[PDB]
Amino acid sequence: FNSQGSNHLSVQYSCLGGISLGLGLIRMKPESKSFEVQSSLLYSQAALKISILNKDRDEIGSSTWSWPSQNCNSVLLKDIYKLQEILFEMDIWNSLLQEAQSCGNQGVN
Amino acid sequence: SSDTQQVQNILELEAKIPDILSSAGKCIEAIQLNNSLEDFRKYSKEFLETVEFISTGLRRQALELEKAEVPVVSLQPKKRYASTPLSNLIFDQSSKLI
Amino acid sequence: DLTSIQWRMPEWVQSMGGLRTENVLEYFSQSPFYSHKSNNEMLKMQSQFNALDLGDLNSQLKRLTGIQFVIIHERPPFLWVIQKQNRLNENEVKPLTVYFVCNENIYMAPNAYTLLATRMLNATYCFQKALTKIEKFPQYNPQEGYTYPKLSNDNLEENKNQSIEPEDFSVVRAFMQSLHSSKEAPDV
């Protein structure tokens, strides 16, 4: 798709879908020979840690989300998958804590 | 040509233009330096071809783009949710998540 | 050479105390600009013959054929117009350069076209020179566009329309505006 003042393309990295729309700002990177792409992220990487705090809020149960691993020939497309994964964790946890609204009806806070 | 192939045709059409300037500097060289009418007699039968034939190739890439009739407006996507490969692959992860 | 250049032997004027009438052609006779087969000088040769038979100047001059340096417009006490000419008859004249008293200098009058060509040449030269040690620094790209390479950019630091769906002042501009309003806020 057409993009902004960047003159580049506006590819939808989030072609597979999620919630909030996502298009990568294609960007030439002279060091890379290829042309590495980034978005609005300040974060270098992101996902979703989970764990069970005790009465002392010591660890009990715990885990963390992990995406299935794409292994496409183009690492660029792989990073499209990565930014997809990012917008994914975004839209989900943001929607959830946005929904946190009335969590208090059975003690959840 | 289909998909990228028209664009690819332009991509290898890319280098077809800059050397036309070599042919043209030589068009000047024909009398400025080489001092022979025969040279530009040939390159006027070359420069105009190397330029214009590419120009026609371009104008036909565009007019036949206008035959292919690709829409110019970008659709505003609905907030897409889940394509099937995404869904079942997430299920594959769920197996991995077991 | 014939333009704005010094050629002075002031002590002659120091003796004369300045020019009078025919004595302008004396210091002018000292000048290269003076011609030898001018009627002023061939009848200077007449001064070396007849001597007495020259009158003022123009009577003996213009009646006789050849190069001359006639006087028409005095500008006391500095300039005096004196055009070069070539009589072809006792009646006919074929005027040349207006030599003029540039004060301790006398010059041929330049063509307008000379200076005009100087202006044209120097201006287009400024254009071409603008194209010289300046051009081809903004290297073109279809994508990047023109480029401006640097060891360090700072200092400071037909496409697409539809896309994704500072103000270096910290709104300081409006703050200054408010300062304009507020400096006389008590006053107004």
Curated annotation (Swiss-Prot), chain A:
It is found in: Nucleus. Belongs to the Mediator complex subunit 17 family. Component of the Mediator complex. Interacts with med18, prk1 and rbp1. Component of the Mediator complex, a coactivator involved in the regulated transcription of nearly all RNA polymerase II-dependent genes. Mediator functions as a bridge to convey information from gene-specific regulatory proteins to the basal RNA polymerase II transcription machinery. Mediator is recruited to promoters by direct interactions with regulatory proteins and serves as a scaffold for the assembly of a functional preinitiation complex with RNA polymerase II and the general transcription factors. This is Mediator of RNA polymerase II transcription subunit 17. It comes from Schizosaccharomyces pombe (strain 972 / ATCC 24843). The chain holds residues 219 to 327 of 545 of the full protein.
Curated annotation (Swiss-Prot), chain B:
GO terms for biological process: positive regulation of transcription initiation by RNA polymerase II. GO terms for molecular function: transcription coactivator activity. It comes from the Eukaryota. Transmembrane segments: none annotated. Gene3D superfamilies: 1.10.287.3490. Pfam families: Med11. Belongs to the Mediator complex subunit 11 family. This is Mediator of RNA polymerase II transcription subunit 11. It comes from Schizosaccharomyces pombe (strain 972 / ATCC 24843).
Curated annotation (Swiss-Prot), chain C:
The keyword Transit peptide does not apply. Keywords: Activator, Nucleus, Transcription, Transcription regulation. One of its GO terms (cellular component) is mediator complex. One of its GO terms (biological process) is regulation of transcription by RNA polymerase II. One of its GO terms (molecular function) is transcription coactivator activity. It holds the Pfam family Med6. InterPro entries: Mediator_Med6, Mediator_Med6_fun, Mediator_Med6_sf. Transmembrane segments: none annotated. It is found in: Nucleus. Component of the Mediator complex. Belongs to the Mediator complex subunit 6 family. Component of the Mediator complex, a coactivator involved in the regulated transcription of nearly all RNA polymerase II-dependent genes. Mediator functions as a bridge to convey information from gene-specific regulatory proteins to the basal RNA polymerase II transcription machinery. Mediator is recruited to promoters by direct interactions with regulatory proteins and serves as a scaffold for the assembly of a functional preinitiation complex with RNA polymerase II and the general transcription factors. This is Mediator of RNA polymerase II transcription subunit 6.
